[PDB]
Design a protein around this nucleic acid. Structure first.
Ligand SMILES: [Mg+2]
Ligand SMILES: [Mg+2]
Length: 98
RNA sequence: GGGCAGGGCGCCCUGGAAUGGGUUCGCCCCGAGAGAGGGGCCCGUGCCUUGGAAAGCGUCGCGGUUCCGGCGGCGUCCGG
């Protein structure tokens, strides 16, 4: 599933609710509003491990995106770069099924 | 020494930004958190004050007929 994840991301971007960035992703997972977290592969190792531990506490799925932050950003369609991304809800998608 | 200007910060908190925005003479900065608020720190050789007017200086006048840090009056102001 190379382009399937990208297509799902592009669909949830316009359909559901998302959170770009790290601090307000941490707020969402702490408040339990996050259903899925996506991490770029070049994010700092300590930050990555902290995110996984937080998600293990919150019983939430974490997916390691194949690309780095720049490609994650352009997959999300934003013109900046993002390391950590959160799905509040897909709305109309099957991303959280996988 | 004390206080306050005034400079700098790759320091923090709230919040999350595309219709992209902030900004320099140039640059440069931002979901690894911009703008917008509120704070914190450092240097403060500048200003005020303690020192400090008592001293210094500029003038006018008396002295020791001299050997005198001699004695007196006034001023040492406001701005760009
Ligand atoms: Mg700012
Ligand atoms: Mg005098």
């Amino acid at each position: 599933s190379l382009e399937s994840i990208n297509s799902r991301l592009q669909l949830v971007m316009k359909s559901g609710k998302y959170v770009l960035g790290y601090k307000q992703s941490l707020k969402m997972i702490r408040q339990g509003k996050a259903k899925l977290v996506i991490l770029a592969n070049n994010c700092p190792a300590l930050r990555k491990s902290e995110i996984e531990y937080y998600a293990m506490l919150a019983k939430t799925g974490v997916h390691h995106y194949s690309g780095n932050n720049i490609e994650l950003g352009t997959a999300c369609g934003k013109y900046y770069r993002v390391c950590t991304l959160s799905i509040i809800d897909p709305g109309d998608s099957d991303i959280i099924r996988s």
